[PDB]
């Protein structure tokens, strides 16, 4: 019968370790299940905040598209202006050349007129001076025609 | 004591084979929990580089968003000069297509003056020639008045 006593005491061994390797799985595996827990935690985390940061990009590029139709609104109004003012510039350019040009003409006729009005005063003092001198001959011819009609009465 | 011994055997062995069962439940499911967290450790690693692409496409466009910002400026800037030169530009032209209005009014005003003034002139011109006639008429008639005298006085 010292079997039985053996074979008791060789089971009572193994349960032992046996025991002991539960309760060491047990505890492994309670770690490792707060292990996994904790890591899809993180994950869920990060999946949140990749989910905001693609909204403000997303916010962005809105903000680029608006930037970039009123870019292109400001380059075409700096076109329309810079158009206008090409033309009025030019309009001035050639209005002033003919300023130019107009200017010098009434400078000439003013001197024309200028030393027209000489020539008439000059020729009104010489006939100032004629009509003196008719007048001076027809005064003689008088005076002769009564002196020959005088004479012939003699 | 035998009866005893083999009853004893027989709850050993019980609980020997239960105890065999945990062990490998329990390293199934060890497996199983190290695999899963091995699995989302992947994919947190991922999220991670994923998260570094996105942040960093966002601070390329904060980094365009500020100099499409002092763009912005630089073309308020272009286009308040551009206005205040076509406004003087305007003036300009204006006052100069005006002033070509008037200066030719002006020599209209000075050729017709002109025209008059040498119209006075080609008159006085004329009766200058009739009084020199005139007085050719009166030298010739008062010469031969003298001699006529002088002849009357020798008779």
Same mark, same amino acid.
């Given at each position: 019968? !010292? =079997?039985?006593?053996?074979?008791?005491?060789?089971?009572?061994?193994?349960?032992? /370790?046996?025991?002991?390797?539960? +309760?060491?799985? !047990?505890?492994?595996?309670? *770690?490792? $299940?707060?292990?996994?827990?904790?890591?899809?935690?993180?994950?869920?985390?990060?999946?949140?905040?990749?989910?905001?940061?693609?909204?403000?990009?997303?916010?962005?590029?809105?903000? +680029?598209?608006? @930037?970039? =139709?009123?870019?292109?609104? @400001?380059?075409?109004?700096?076109?329309? #202006?810079?158009?206008?003012? !090409?033309?009025?510039?030019? *309009?001035?350019?050639?209005?002033?050349?003919?300023?130019?040009?107009?200017? %010098?003409?009434?400078?000439?006729?003013?001197? $024309?007129? @200028? +030393? =027209?009005?000489? !020539?008439? %005063?000059?020729?009104?003092?010489?006939?100032? =001076?004629?009509?003196?001198?008719?007048?001076?001959?027809?005064? %003689?011819?008088? /005076?002769?025609?009564?002196?020959?009609? *005088?004479?012939?009465? #003699?």
């Amino acid at each position: 019968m !010292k =079997q039985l006593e053996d074979k008791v005491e060789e089971l009572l061994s193994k349960n032992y /370790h046996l025991e002991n390797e539960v +309760a060491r799985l !047990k505890k492994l595996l309670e *770690r490792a $299940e707060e292990r996994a827990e904790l890591s899809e935690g993180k994950s869920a985390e990060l999946e949140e905040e990749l989910k905001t940061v693609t909204n403000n990009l997303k916010s962005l590029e809105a903000q +680029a598209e608006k @930037y970039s =139709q009123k870019e292109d609104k @400001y380059e075409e109004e700096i076109k329309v #202006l810079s158009d206008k003012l !090409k033309e009025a510039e030019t *309009r001035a350019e050639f209005a002033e050349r003919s300023v130019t040009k107009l200017e %010098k003409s009434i400078d000439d006729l003013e001197d $024309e007129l @200028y +030393a =027209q009005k000489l !020539k008439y %005063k000059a020729i009104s003092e010489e006939m100032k =001076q004629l009509e003196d001198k008719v007048e001076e001959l027809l005064s %003689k011819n008088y /005076h002769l025609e009564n002196e020959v009609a *005088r004479l012939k009465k #003699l």
